[PDB]
Design a protein around this ligand. Structure first.
Ligand code: HEC
Length: 104
């Protein structure tokens, strides 16, 4: 919505620390690559991991549930997320930058 992908990228690289665990493409550092994470197809998971088209916590793939997962974190078959509480404008910018990540 009212998100800034430049501020979103700055939060992704510094104030959020997401790049140190997540790749902007389809590679896997600690978690899955967030390429296409904001689309209905989801990101690229390693072979064997499957959440049945939903988030690792069980909720479907929507902006609200993805934001709630990011703020809450959790553990799935791959690794462990950390809780990243953030303001609403920062979350909007972060979701915008995640939208900028396209999965081929
Ligand atoms: C290392 C501690 C990480 C940090 C820093 C960030 N993420 Fe994370 N993320 C990590 C793991 C190990 C996983 C997979 C969990 C599992 O085992 O199932 C994830 C997952 C996500 C997801 C969901 C992916 C999906 O397929 O639905 C999202 C949307 C996500 N991560 C986003 C995200 C953001 C916005 C971060 C900065 C606040 C961030 N991650 C940091 C590990 C780590």
């Amino acid at each position: 919505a009212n998100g800034d992908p430049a501020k979103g990228q700055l939060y992704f690289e510094n104030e959020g620390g997401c790049l140190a665990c997540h790749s902007t493409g389809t590679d896997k550092l600690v978690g899955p690559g967030l390429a296409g994470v904001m689309t209905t197809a989801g990101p690229v998971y390693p072979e064997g991991v499957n959440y049945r088209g939903n988030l690792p916590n069980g909720q479907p793939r929507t902006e609200e549930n993805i934001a709630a997962w990011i703020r809450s974190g959790g553990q799935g078959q791959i690794g462990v997320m950390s809780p990243h509480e953030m303001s609403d404008e920062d979350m909007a910018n972060l979701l915008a930058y995640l939208h900028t990540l396209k999965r081929p």
